[PDB]
Amino acid sequence: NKYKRIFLVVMDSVGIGEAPDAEQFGDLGSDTIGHIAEHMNGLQMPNMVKLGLGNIREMKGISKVEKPLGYYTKMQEKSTGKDTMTGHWEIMGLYIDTPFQVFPEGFPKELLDELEEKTGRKIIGNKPASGTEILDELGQEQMETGSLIVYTSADSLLQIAAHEEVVPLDELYKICKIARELTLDEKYMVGRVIARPFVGEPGNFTRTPNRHDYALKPFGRTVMNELKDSDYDVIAIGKISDIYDGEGVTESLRTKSNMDGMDKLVDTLNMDFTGLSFLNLVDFDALFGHRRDPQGYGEALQEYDARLPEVFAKLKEDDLLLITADHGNDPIHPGTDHTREYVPLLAYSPSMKEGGQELPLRQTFADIGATVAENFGVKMPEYGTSFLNEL
Ligand SMILES: [Mn+2]
Ligand SMILES: [Mn+2]
Numbered sequence: 379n380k381y382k383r384i385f386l387v388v389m390d391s392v393g394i395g396e397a398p399d400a401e402q403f404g405d406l407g408s409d410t411i412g413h414i415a416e417h418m419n420g421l422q423m424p425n426m427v428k429l430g431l432g433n434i435r436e437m438k439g440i441s442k443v444e445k446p447l448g449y450y451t452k453m454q455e456k457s458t459g460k461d462t463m464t465g466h467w468e469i470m471g472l473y474i475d476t477p478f479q480v481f482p483e484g485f486p487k488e489l490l491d492e493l494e495e496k497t498g499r500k501i502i503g504n505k506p507a508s509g510t511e512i513l514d515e516l517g518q519e520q521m522e523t524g525s526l527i528v529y530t531s532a533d534s535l536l537q538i539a540a541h542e543e544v545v546p547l548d549e550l551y552k553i554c555k556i557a558r559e560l561t562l563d564e565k566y567m568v569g570r571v572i573a574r575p576f577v578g579e580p581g582n583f584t585r586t587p588n589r590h591d592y593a594l595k596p597f598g599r600t601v602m603n604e605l606k607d608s609d610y611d612v613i614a615i616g617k618i619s620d621i622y623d624g625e626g627v628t629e630s631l632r633t634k635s636n637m638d639g640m641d642k643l644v645d646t647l648n649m650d651f652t653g654l655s656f657l658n659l660v661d662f663d664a665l666f667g668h669r670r671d672p673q674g675y676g677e678a679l680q681e682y683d684a685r686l687p688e689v690f691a692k693l694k695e696d697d698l699l700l701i702t703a704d705h706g707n708d709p710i711h712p713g714t715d716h717t718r719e720y721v722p723l724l725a726y727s728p729s730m731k732e733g734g735q736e737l738p739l740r741q742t743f744a745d746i747g748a749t750v751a752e753n754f755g756v757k758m759p760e761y762g763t764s765f766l767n768e769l
């Protein structure tokens with residue numbers, strides 16, 4: 379292998395400007411990094427700048443450098459949707475025609491009607507809400523009627539809440555499995571069904587750790603599958619295992635925040651493995667993008683960039699670091715949905731003794747998967763063009 383270890387970091391939702399098909403998605407004008415940089419009166423990201431971020435695209439506080447540490451370009455998404463599953467699936471070698479849907483006004487009546495009809499239970503709520511607001515609002519009614527509280531988020535989720543002393547857990551998991559079948563339907567395609575059991579009394583409801591998720595497998599065997607089947611390590615950090623429903627994962631490390639994700643990245647640098655270490659930094663999407671909070675997003679980007687020198691210090695001559703994103707989520711854009719954007723790509727190894735150069739624009743995210751597969755000598759994905767020999 380040219381590289382013994384590859385460290386792939388998805389900065390979740392960190393877009394670098396409107397894609398050529400943004401108009402189809404109502405995403406004209408979008409620019410996640412750009413708008414944040416203007417809000418911050420200059421983003422302070424000196425380490426991403428040293429890698430070549432401003433060589434991809436100059437933005438406020440983010441300038442090009444003469445000798446970038448590694449190679450740089452951007453990537454265009456080929457898949458139909460702009461959700462997290464689509465983007466990640468494409469990164470690992472797939473093409474996804476059928477988008478996952480989001481439900482800001484609630485789920486369609488036809489779906490909720492069929493869930494009632496299969497379960498024998500009435501549904502209440504049916505809107506985007508936090509766990510806390512929805513339980514305050516409807517927890518008491520739920521307790522008194524046996525009804526199911528159905529809510530959503532700004533992401534592709536269907537969440538079903540019920541009190542553990544009113545709806546037994548096993549019954550709630552059965553209900554979520556029925557909902558998971560009903561939502562494999564392109565009219566209603568949700569990424570994840572989540573059981574949200576709770577306990578307590580009105581005024582004091584708490585969600586319990588008995589949460590269970592019902593995800594879809596990727597629509598194809600990914601590069602991760604091929605790695606795992608060839609006895610490589612595939613270390614998933616953060617939401618990566620959930621995103622691929624475990625497919626192809628040999629070890630999974632839960633994280634609680636972006637700093638904790640960078641700590642687990644560092645833990646993997648200290649491991650003797652051969653294969654892929656794959657990190658998702660989700661806070662950018664979950665806390666700041668969907669909440670349309672440019673200040674919080676800005677601070678988080680700065681906090682991330684400050685962790686990078688330690689990663690540079692630990693990379694070996696036969697390691698490769700890849701940094702990208704899975705879509706945009708511009709915190710100064712209408713609504714609460716993602717944005718259809720190009721994503722940055724940075725590729726760095728300390729064996730790059732002269733620094734890097736510009737790569738041709740990657741016409742699918744699957745170029746990353748193709749690179750990884752070529753590096754490790756495993757079956758090449760159906761989609762994607764490796765840039766391994768360009769490095
Ligand atoms: Mn939009
Ligand atoms: Mn995402």
Ligand SMILES: [Mn+2]
Binds near residue numbers: 707
């Ligand atoms: Mn999201």
